[PDB]
Amino acid sequence: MNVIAILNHMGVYFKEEPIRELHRALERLNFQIVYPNDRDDLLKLIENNARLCGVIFDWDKYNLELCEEISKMNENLPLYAFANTYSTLDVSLNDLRLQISFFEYALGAAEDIANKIKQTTDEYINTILPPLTKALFKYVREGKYTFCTPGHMGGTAFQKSPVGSLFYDFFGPNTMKSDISISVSELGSLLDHSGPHKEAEQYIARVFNADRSYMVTNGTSTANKIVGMYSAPAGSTILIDRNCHKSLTHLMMMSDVTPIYFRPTRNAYGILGGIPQSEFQHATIAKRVKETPNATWPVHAVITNSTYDGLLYNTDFIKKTLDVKSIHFDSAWVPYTNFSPIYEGKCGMSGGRVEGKVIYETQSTHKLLAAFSQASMIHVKGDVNEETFNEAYMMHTTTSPHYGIVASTETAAAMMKGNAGKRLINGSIERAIKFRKEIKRLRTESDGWFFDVWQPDHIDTTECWPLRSDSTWHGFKNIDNEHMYLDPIKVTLLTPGMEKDGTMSDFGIPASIVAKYLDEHGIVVEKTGPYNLLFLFSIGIDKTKALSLLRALTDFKRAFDLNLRVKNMLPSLYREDPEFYENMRIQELAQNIHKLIVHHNLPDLMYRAFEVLPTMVMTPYAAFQKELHGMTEEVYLDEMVGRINANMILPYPPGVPLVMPGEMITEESRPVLEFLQMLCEIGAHYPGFETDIHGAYRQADGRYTVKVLKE
Amino acid sequence: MNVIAILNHMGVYFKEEPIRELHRALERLNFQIVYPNDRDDLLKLIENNARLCGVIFDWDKYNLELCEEISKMNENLPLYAFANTYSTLDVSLNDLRLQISFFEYALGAAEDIANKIKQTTDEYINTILPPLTKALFKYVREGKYTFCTPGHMGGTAFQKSPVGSLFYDFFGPNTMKSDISISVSELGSLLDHSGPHKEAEQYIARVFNADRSYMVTNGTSTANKIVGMYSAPAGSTILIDRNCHKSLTHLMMMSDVTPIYFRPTRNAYGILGGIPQSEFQHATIAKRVKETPNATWPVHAVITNSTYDGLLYNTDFIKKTLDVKSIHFDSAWVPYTNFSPIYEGKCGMSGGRVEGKVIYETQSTHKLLAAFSQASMIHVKGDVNEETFNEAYMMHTTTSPHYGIVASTETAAAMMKGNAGKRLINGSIERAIKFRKEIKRLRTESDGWFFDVWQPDHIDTTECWPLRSDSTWHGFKNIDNEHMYLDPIKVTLLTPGMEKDGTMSDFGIPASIVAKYLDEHGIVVEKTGPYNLLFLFSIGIDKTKALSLLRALTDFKRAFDLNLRVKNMLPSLYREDPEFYENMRIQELAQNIHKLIVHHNLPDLMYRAFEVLPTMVMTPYAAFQKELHGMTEEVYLDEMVGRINANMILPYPPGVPLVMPGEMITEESRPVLEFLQMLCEIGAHYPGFETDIHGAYRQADGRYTVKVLKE
């Protein structure tokens, strides 16, 4: 905030020489001065920037509707109207409700005007800032010597070493002084929820429409642990989504709990869809309790809302009909929910306080909002035992947190209050929708093949487009109406190779080549399956990045039709093994990997492997207990049927836990083994496209091993 | 030439204000002005630079011995003495024989003095320049439009294309305008030896002490062809050194000639030594004529003087006792011979015109002198048929030569006239000798192992150190006294692995690792054998490069004793196959390649393979004739005995033709086949150290093929 914009030169002297004196005084007060030519120049200057902290304009040539337009753009922005001809009498109430401060044109009075402008800018900065970030900035500005942890003590240890000086010159001084610990008593403490921290969690609670809100400093991988260790005591039972994270599996291995796994649907692409409506009612839950050993009525439920590919649920249905005392939504990919009414009825915090149960939501703030990594939140909705749940939160977090992460966690919510946050969210959603409309437009504009995007055939409104059973763009057969809602900002491109009914085509490009090409040209894809990409259109995405992406896709199309060699187009993949990719064209490589997928029948195996659940011999807690006692042997992959698995098997494709720790592959679940063997067989042909299975360990001969339990 | 150096400020005004006016006038005439503080400053300024083209000094405070010292440094350098107090009378003859022009201290007369200084500098430039380079520079300065070949026509085709503009911006304008053809009539023609060209060959003839000197524009690979096609008609017989170039083999395949091969000696290192004294007398030559089919008395002899490793011959012995009518010295590696009396009696042009035979010498000017590549000369000594030999020269050279190469060829000799060329050659030889003295000093200073240099144990004088039979540093057993002379500027380092008697040690580093490390650190080795390097200490080498080399050797020693990994120290070799060099230390790699050399017994096989000559079934001209008719088949390497070879086999190590085209490997020459098979066996283990055999073609299975003749 040092940019203060003065409107145009009227022409007469008595209201220009005071303006030039105020210009000189403001430059003396370390303010950059910009000179927009007219009104629309000011509108564009304010929307394209954010460092602007003041507008000076004459109240004669520009009326007070150029206070209201800026108010629609930013409510808290100070503007400085200069009163010459309009008297006191010419002011309405709507002018008085805006951030304007009136001044006069007097020669030699520029010093007091500049001091008042500096004070107003300071008030604006101290108004828009959240309280803990405000206090941290104040503490760094009054920077005191310290004799406490951390050891760098304001980064003055990095000023006395060469590699330390490189680190210090990279990061800069303010992010070294911002790292302090709980010994600084004026900032309170995260662990005890005191002072500026307590004001911060109350601020987070207002913003996100939650009763009590927490600010985790390790991540939602730890927030899931906190929620599932509070609400699910040992010996109890949980309803965990099979579409889960590794963190929930880790939680189940720490705690002595027992699962019933929900059964999500999926298409031939490998996109993890959702649980049908039948598996949230009392009948199916009671049945699955009945045929699970050592199982009682579930006391907690964990649901991934949304999925990895951005499929929201009808959460009002869930909160009405799921008859458990605590429903947890692992909303790691949807933290931005409250800030656009598009997502109404699509999160745990949507709607009011539900009766008889506590709704948890564990937004991963760093993922889609603007926050530093390892930042997360736990929003609750209901009544919880305050000391027990506070102690459970204290149990998993560290004792001396990184205050940069905490300040970023709060500043992410502070970016969403007012009109600026609504403008951010609506701009991101509208930009995502416009990108979707041209990618379907360029599909019908181009010749031959082009990238498809997995979205409804007619989208033109800003809403979460519901997945209807009467349409076939999604691919989930016999899907329930109003249970799924596509998130517009998680754009999933598609590549040729798949037909609409689910069978495979002949000409195709698997998405690994497209992702590697985009990585070569300096744009990064989130994660790819066999024939899909994913692009997070968060609040950071502007039209520069969107156009560069669209124009990396087009250059890939041109380079693939021209059929350039692997050496020229993909040097990063060429360097994987130059002997192999020396005389190979890209069309031959794409055709070869596509034929390896087709002949081995990848999508049918990937479907039929996840439509059958492995037999739960013992709870994953018992599997971890037997793993700790050294009762694990590494049998080869083929002889794994009838054996209890000790470590989780997580195959890419698709990215969802296939075999849990403690489950047996029986003869009824042989397509699981066939899929694993097929994936190992196809991954050992072409370098750079190596097999990515978390749990299976590569040997030298080419056959993988899985840690199973001894007999 | 725009640097004119004025000596110090006396203090009084009448000889300072004219000096300042002359300063201003000379800067107006585009002369850079330097200000050395005193006399020794001027001496150091002149030796460290060459762009200085004038010294202005006062004749009072500095005597005329600071004209004689500069004359010893540069004879033609103009200096401008300013006469104030010493009258006309105070001048000796030795002052008058120097390049001084006297001036006076007059106010307002700086314009005429500056014009005279500019004219004197122009005279100096037109004096030191050779005539054809002078005329080419004049032609480019008066740059005229052209409508003839070449097509770029002064580089104005490169000013109208993007990649052409990149080429033009790299090379610069003057080297584009300098490329013209024979259509420019004022520069004469190389082919017809007219005008400025004819003055250039006469200039080359003076400089190098030769009767008729030619300036080849393809290289000495073509000069050897010219000499051997003039002096050796078809059906005649030649005495060609076995230590020859590929170009001489190519000459023998073009022309219908018949060889007797001289038999050079060699040590266990693989250094190609020289022919003994017995193989230049009439008895052995007549014997080898007698047991060669279709052979008569030789009419020409070709001798590589020096060898690749810089071993000069006692050429007076050769020119006295070799009873052939034309002796050719392929002096590609020793072109600098005339310019230091160290090399007296060590070239074809050494001594006077020998009676009864014509001595050829074909100095490769680009190799060790300062000339552009593909530049060569043919110096003759004797009487030749002028039109026949001119037509033979015209036969192999092009018709439109690159005048940059021709101008560089003449300017290389022009760099050697006067005191500057003698200073260059003596400085290069003295720098080489001083480098040799510290590399033997650092060998005895360091701990454990260090690099040895293959040179006599006591060297302290500036001479070609003779290879004496009473010493064992060279390794050539029963060598003849005063037949070999080590060239001091071709420094051959040695690595551990060899004992002094010829047997192999246990701890060793083959020279490929050292060469690759030096290439990683940005210094290039000429060519390496198994355990030797080679460094050309030409006139370009100053102490910066020498110290950087010595200090790349030392850093290699430190990194090898510390035993750093291949990944950190040799990333360029790491990228050859990252899977193999991932977890390998440098000591393990060096030990492994050394053990591969030891167990397979490389030096004994490399010795015994070259001590036996393959059986000449037919002349290489007939081998090329049968090769052109498609009578060649590719048999594998093992079944090559009893078969006539069609293409030359040139194995690295060492770098000398082993099997000639048209020769059979018999049972008496089985160690040749054993050496070839051993080299193929050891080269197929470690990547980046691949087998380098010119003639043997690699197959996919790992067994090589050689093109032999059909039966």
Short mmCIF file of N, CA and C in Angstrom, two decimals, chain A residues 10 13 55 97 134 161 209 257 275 295 300 303 330 364 447 461 484 505 530 533 536 541 576 582-583 610 622 657:
data_model
loop_
_atom_site.label_atom_id
_atom_site.label_comp_id
_atom_site.label_asym_id
_atom_site.label_seq_id
_atom_site.Cartn_x
_atom_site.Cartn_y
_atom_site.Cartn_z
N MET A 10 -7.31 19.67 -14.21
CA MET A 10 -8.49 20.47 -14.59
C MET A 10 -8.05 21.54 -15.56
N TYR A 13 -5.27 26.95 -12.02
CA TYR A 13 -4.09 26.87 -11.17
C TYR A 13 -4.40 26.59 -9.71
N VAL A 55 -7.34 7.08 -3.74
CA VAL A 55 -7.67 7.82 -4.95
C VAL A 55 -7.93 9.25 -4.54
N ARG A 97 -21.75 6.93 3.53
CA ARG A 97 -21.48 5.55 3.92
C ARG A 97 -20.25 5.00 3.23
N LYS A 134 -1.79 -8.74 11.70
CA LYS A 134 -1.51 -7.36 12.09
C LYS A 134 -0.50 -7.30 13.22
N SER A 161 27.07 -16.89 7.26
CA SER A 161 27.52 -18.11 6.60
C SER A 161 27.27 -17.96 5.11
N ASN A 209 -18.59 -19.55 8.69
CA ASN A 209 -19.89 -19.96 9.23
C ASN A 209 -19.77 -21.28 10.00
N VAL A 257 -9.88 -49.02 15.68
CA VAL A 257 -11.22 -48.83 15.14
C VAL A 257 -11.49 -49.91 14.10
N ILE A 275 -20.51 -42.23 -3.80
CA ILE A 275 -21.31 -43.29 -3.17
C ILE A 275 -22.76 -43.12 -3.60
N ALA A 295 -18.09 -55.71 15.08
CA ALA A 295 -18.57 -54.41 14.65
C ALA A 295 -19.86 -54.05 15.37
N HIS A 300 -19.06 -42.58 13.97
CA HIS A 300 -18.46 -41.50 13.20
C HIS A 300 -18.47 -41.88 11.73
N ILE A 303 -16.38 -38.65 4.98
CA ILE A 303 -16.80 -38.58 3.58
C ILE A 303 -15.91 -37.57 2.87
N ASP A 330 -14.23 -34.60 4.59
CA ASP A 330 -12.82 -34.34 4.31
C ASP A 330 -12.75 -33.41 3.11
N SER A 364 -8.66 -28.01 3.54
CA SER A 364 -7.23 -27.82 3.33
C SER A 364 -7.03 -26.46 2.68
N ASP A 447 -9.57 -29.62 -36.68
CA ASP A 447 -9.66 -30.75 -37.59
C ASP A 447 -9.18 -32.03 -36.91
N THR A 461 -24.39 -21.42 -17.57
CA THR A 461 -24.75 -20.73 -16.35
C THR A 461 -23.72 -21.03 -15.27
N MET A 484 -24.84 -35.53 -7.23
CA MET A 484 -23.55 -35.06 -7.69
C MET A 484 -23.68 -33.72 -8.39
N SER A 505 -11.18 -46.60 -28.19
CA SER A 505 -11.03 -46.32 -29.60
C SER A 505 -9.74 -46.97 -30.11
N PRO A 530 -5.11 -42.31 -16.91
CA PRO A 530 -4.78 -42.88 -18.22
C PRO A 530 -5.06 -41.92 -19.37
N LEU A 533 -6.58 -35.25 -17.68
CA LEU A 533 -5.77 -34.31 -16.94
C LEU A 533 -6.63 -33.65 -15.87
N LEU A 536 -6.44 -27.13 -11.64
CA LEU A 536 -7.06 -26.39 -10.55
C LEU A 536 -7.15 -24.93 -10.97
N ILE A 541 -5.45 -18.22 -10.69
CA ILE A 541 -5.43 -18.34 -12.15
C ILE A 541 -6.04 -17.09 -12.76
N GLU A 576 15.80 -39.68 -20.32
CA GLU A 576 15.54 -40.86 -19.49
C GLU A 576 16.33 -42.06 -19.99
N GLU A 582 15.88 -42.64 -29.41
CA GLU A 582 16.72 -41.96 -30.39
C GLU A 582 15.98 -41.76 -31.71
N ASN A 583 15.42 -42.83 -32.26
CA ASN A 583 14.79 -42.81 -33.57
C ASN A 583 13.30 -43.15 -33.49
N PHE A 610 -12.15 -52.53 -8.82
CA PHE A 610 -12.70 -51.68 -7.78
C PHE A 610 -14.18 -51.92 -7.52
N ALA A 622 -4.87 -53.85 13.81
CA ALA A 622 -4.23 -55.13 14.07
C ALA A 622 -3.17 -55.45 13.02
N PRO A 657 -6.98 -45.86 -2.63
CA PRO A 657 -6.54 -47.11 -2.00
C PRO A 657 -7.31 -48.35 -2.42
#
